[PDB]
What does this fold into?
Amino acid sequence: SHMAPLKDVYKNDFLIGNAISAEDLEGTRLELLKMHHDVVTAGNAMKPDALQPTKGNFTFTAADAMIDKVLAEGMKMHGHVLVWHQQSPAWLNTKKDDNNNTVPLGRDEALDNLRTHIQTVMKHFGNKVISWDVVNEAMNDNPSNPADYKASLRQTPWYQAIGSDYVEQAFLAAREVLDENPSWNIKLYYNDYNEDNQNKATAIYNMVKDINDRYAAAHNGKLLIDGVGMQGHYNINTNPDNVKLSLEKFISLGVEVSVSELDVTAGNNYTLPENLAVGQAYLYAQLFKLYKEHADHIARVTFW
Ligand SMILES: [Cl-]
Ligand SMILES: [Mg+2]
Ligand SMILES: [Mg+2]
It folds into this structure.
């Protein structure tokens, strides 16, 4: 419940977003969506399982209905998500062996599927989105050696098929689509959660800095990764000082930052309903005060 239209309050600071399903585009839900938000994210409709459920059967119909309705209603669209370990069909990066066990594909076949998916889906929606999450949730939680970002990457199905360079290869494939369609203004994001954990933030920073420093040196200073998304699945024991330290660390890469899936839930420990509501309201207030203070480098704040 918002007591003043949020997109109006924050119009000079950052886009205000919400994640939606098709139900949100009808009735009182659509009026609330429009009044408070400038930008939407599809909760599920643009994920790899929703867009390419089997090899070469691209299924864009429902996604196109959603994004055309969002634009007709005067809102923008953030694309979520080209490459993820969850909600991603097995055929992209595994096969069945002769005894019907699931095993990884080889690197070349898996790259080919990775590039084809990214490049087909990006070209289908074109500039109907303002941004894409190119890769989501690639980094382990609480990595013990964050100075070595490649050792800190989750051993997901893409990592097991392609190797530690697959995040870089995903962004190179998406950047080639934009190079070939120069009039599209679309920001390429890396998105992850638990970025208030300082080790995980250091690992993410080291990954983006390596990828972007090598790309910029070869491309007249142009960055590869334009944005870091902080998912913001926080709880009432999240320390807003740790959110500020990571926010500032990502700003120091020269990228924009967005908050992509913000929600505040109870902690580990048993809370009790009034104490829970006070904790949630106080964190939200502290986070928006921090975001306003850094608005020159925050493009969007989207709720879950
Ligand atoms: Cl986060
Ligand atoms: Mg801003
Ligand atoms: Mg063009």
Summary: The longest strand covers residues 256-265. Residues 1-304 form a domain with the TIM Barrel fold (CATH 3.20.20.80). The chain is about 40% helix and 20% strand.
